[PDB]
Design a protein around this ligand. Structure first.
Ligand SMILES: [Mg+2]
Lengths: 126, 69, 174, 52, 100, 108, 110
RNA sequence: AUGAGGUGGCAAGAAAUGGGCUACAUUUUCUACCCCAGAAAACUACGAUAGCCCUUAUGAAACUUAAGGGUCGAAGGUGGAUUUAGC
């Protein structure tokens, strides 16, 4: 009517700040490229960016929390956390689809490790 | 130098495969040019970028097929 | 006396086979094919079969996409090369009317194109070798004039006409 | 498995070849990591395996 | 479908340099010695010059592989400062942490 | 023929079961060739066309057609000394370099 | 439906549950492990949904029982060092030449 | 003709105020040395990351950029008000 009358949940990853990455958080992607003497760090970074974009675009609104991309040898393990909103048959379809498509795009044995939670696991409210 | 040192150096150079015939600094550039792959033929040069044709077209093809948002 | 021991040789997967022989089956878990998250674990035989079929359908969709657009999957980055992770080609590459084209189309099991190329080779008057005719009859007889995916033999089908047309018939053809 | 157990297990075929074996005086495995706890666990694993 | 026309030019530049690298190297080696006659070295000088301008290795710039920013690109990751900070601060670059 | 091949593929199915555990998947991937074979050999799948060391180090058997004592001999000696020190080129590419030089000098 | 840790006996054969390197599965590990910086007047986060536990390169597939069982099976593949070569003094007497070569284990497609 | 070409010209001058820039020499410079030595010393003194010439490096390309040598040996002669820093 007149002026003087007038006058967010966060996950553990979201809650903590960038200056805690080696103190309270960890690294979502884990590989040997950045170690001293190792090579191909940029290729791994590009692969990581494409992996995250693809996984978020192929599981729209299903991913509760960020991906974790692990590499052992030439294996590529996508540990994802999703919700229980989508039907299990569609989850299996998408799992097989993504596994095959990423294996043939990167020429390595990709594998995917869905973990369903009932809902977002809030840590604080910011 | 000496006679002896010159001959032993020129023989050890023949055993280990270095330049036998005496040469100068400017001419030694050929050995270096042919000992290392040129900068344009290194994989960090000609493959510096991701393709960006496959990456972008694939997303388009995936969306047209209704498998990607 | 330094008695050097005799080297032991084993297959490339021998160590994994031994480690597998170390472990038994898990009594509290569904088969390894399914996900160990509770929500995605199957609850019934029908549900387990349905989940398996859904996974296989997703795999086949991915394979169809790969084979439809090899240009996006041609780039090789893995050393040693992995042939089983490259696209497969089903389209004949040889387009001229020649016996090699017929051999390639028989190799690819394209019944219709194979018989069509045999007709073209006959129309050109080129003598088709007995071996290629035998291969064509092998394809037609195995598949019964239909493309690869029972069929009842139909009189005067492609295989039968081709058999009748052969100048010389040996044991293999019969 | 309480009752249902494998009756026999196909042990892998390791053949004693006719050729002589290689001899290694020393074998140094240097592992690099971004974490000290991971390297401690790996050291425990590797040492136990070598002892066994 | 590259990031920019500027990047597309570099991709064109990087393509040509790879194709012409062997020819440039051999012709260059003729001119970088005090052995061959000056008559030949001058002939190569015209021949190396006539090779197409985009084939030369010096005209290639290390742009960001994601934003095509000409400067501020760390070569070890091929990423501009802004993109590196975004990924590094989210913990998406293995081993990278803010120093203390 | 086709009949025997298809019969063998039918024989493949009678023991075609799903993977039973992780070791089984690793074994199948190893047989398929997808997984690396251990212990890691960084030169696995690369034999350098079966060349021996002496095809890489002694490249003066390809300088028989050049002048034997002039300045071109000195130049090609430098070229071959450089080429004998490449771990990044195969013998064929080194020979291609040498033959390009031969052709160029013949033209001039 | 409940997690399958409820059915796990206290005297089970753990190596069979985690035969190979696998990510942390809270429905498969019968441990009440918690990980996270505890909140003001609170506790570290529980395992279900905990991304920190899922980011660890855990050694559940390598326990002492598992390692010993593996190393009792892998003895068939080993040979015996020549007993004559008791020390370096005899190694440098009978086998004077020493060849050093190195192998590299990274993670990647190539 | 906001398109494509061609012919000529166009490559400025002076203060100021605003601020990143070398030495002015004796507790100095050169040599030996790495701290017990010998010389030179304010007009054959010191000093220039000033100018000019020539070589080398990298590159197709060097007045272009960098380094070295030679030439040169300029101002500089310690600069107030103010004023810049510090634990
Ligand atoms: Mg002008």
């Amino acid at each position: 009517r007149e002026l003087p009358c007038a006058w967010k949940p966060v996950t553990y990853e979201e809650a903590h700040a960038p200056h805690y990455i080696a103190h309270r958080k960890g690294w979502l992607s884990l590989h040997t490229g950045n170690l001293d003497g190792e090579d191909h760090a940029a290729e791994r970074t590009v692969e990581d960016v494409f992996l995250r974009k693809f996984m978020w675009g192929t599981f729209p609104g299903c991913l509760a929390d960020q991906l974790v991309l692990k590499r052992r040898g030439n294996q590529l393990e996508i540990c994802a956390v999703v919700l229980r909103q989508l039907s299990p048959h569609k989850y299996y379809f998408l799992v097989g689809y993504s596994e095959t498509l990423l294996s043939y795009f990167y020429k390595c044995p990709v594998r995917l490790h869905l973990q369903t939670v009932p809902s977002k696991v809030v840590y604080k409210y910011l | 130098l000496s006679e002896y040192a010159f001959r032993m150096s020129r023989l050890s150079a023949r055993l280990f495969g270095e330049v036998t015939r005496p040469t100068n600094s400017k001419s030694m550039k050929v050995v270096k040019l042919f000992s290392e792959l040129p900068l344009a033929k290194k994989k960090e040069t000609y493959d510096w970028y991701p393709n960006h044709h496959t990456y972008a077209e694939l997303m388009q093809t995936l969306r047209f097929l209704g498998l990607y948002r | 006396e330094v008695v050097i021991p005799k080297k032991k040789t084993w297959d490339k997967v021998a160590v994994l086979q031994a480690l597998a022989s170390t472990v038994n089956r898990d009594t509290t878990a569904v088969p390894y094919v399914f996900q160990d998250d509770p929500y995605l674990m199957p609850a019934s035989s029908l549900e387990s079969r349905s989940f398996l079929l859904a996974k296989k359908s997703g795999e086949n969709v991915a394979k169809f996409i790969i084979n439809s657009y090899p240009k996006y999957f041609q780039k090789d980055i893995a050393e040693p090369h992995i042939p089983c992770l490259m696209p497969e080609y089903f389209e004949p590459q040889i387009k001229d009317i020649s016996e090699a084209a017929l051999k390639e189309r028989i190799e690819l099991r394209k019944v219709k194109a194979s018989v069509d190329m045999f007709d073209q080779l006959l129309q050109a008057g080129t003598t088709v070798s007995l071996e290629t005719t035998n291969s064509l009859l092998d394809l037609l007889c195995y598949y019964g004039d239909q493309e690869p995916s029972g069929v009842t033999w139909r009189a005067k089908n492609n295989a039968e006409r081709i058999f009748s047309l052969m100048p010389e018939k040996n044991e293999h053809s019969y | 498995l309480h009752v249902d157990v494998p009756k026999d297990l196909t042990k892998p075929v390791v053949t004693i070849s006719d050729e002589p074996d290689i001899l290694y005086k020393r074998l140094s495995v240097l592992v690099k990591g971004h974490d000290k706890a991971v390297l401690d666990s790996y050291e425990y694993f590797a040492v136990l395996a070598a002892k066994e | 479908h590259y990031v920019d026309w500027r990047m597309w030019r570099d991709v064109k530049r990087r393509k040509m340099a790879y194709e012409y690298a062997d020819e440039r190297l051999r012709i260059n080696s003729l001119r970088k010695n005090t052995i061959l006659p000056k008559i030949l070295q001058d002939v190569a000088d015209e021949e190396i010059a006539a090779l197409p301008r985009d084939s030369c290795p010096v005209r290639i710039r290390n742009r960001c592989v994601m934003t095509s920013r000409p400067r501020g690109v760390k070569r070890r990751w091929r990423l501009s400062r802004i993109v590196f900070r975004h990924l590094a601060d989210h913990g998406q670059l293995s081993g990278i942490q803010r120093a203390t | 023929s086709l009949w025997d091949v298809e019969f063998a593929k039918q024989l493949a199915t009678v023991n075609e079961q799903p993977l039973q555990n992780g070791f089984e998947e690793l074994i199948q991937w190893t047989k398929e060739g997808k997984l690396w074979e251990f212990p890691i050999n960084n030169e696995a799948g690369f034999d350098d066309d079966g060349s021996e060391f002496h095809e890489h180090i002694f490249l003066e058997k390809h300088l028989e057609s050049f002048p034997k004592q002039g300045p071109i001999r000195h130049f090609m000696e430098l070229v071959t000394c450089g080429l004998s020190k490449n771990p990044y080129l195969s013998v064929k590419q080194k020979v291609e370099h040498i033959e390009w030089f031969r052709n160029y000098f013949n033209e001039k | 439906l409940p997690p399958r840790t409820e059915k796990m006996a206290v005297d089970q054969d753990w190596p069979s549950v985690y035969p190979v390197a696998a990510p942390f599965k809270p429905s498969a590990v019968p441990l009440p492990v918690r990980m996270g910086y505890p909140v003001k007047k609170g506790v570290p986060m529980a395992k279900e949904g905990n991304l920190e536990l899922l980011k660890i390169p855990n050694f559940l597939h390598l326990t002492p029982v598992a390692i010993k069982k593996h190393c009792e099976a892998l003895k068939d593949f080993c040979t015996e060092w020549p007993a004559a070569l008791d020390s370096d003094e005899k190694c440098e007497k009978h086998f004077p030449i020493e060849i050093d070569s190195t192998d590299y284990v990274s993670s990647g497609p190539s």
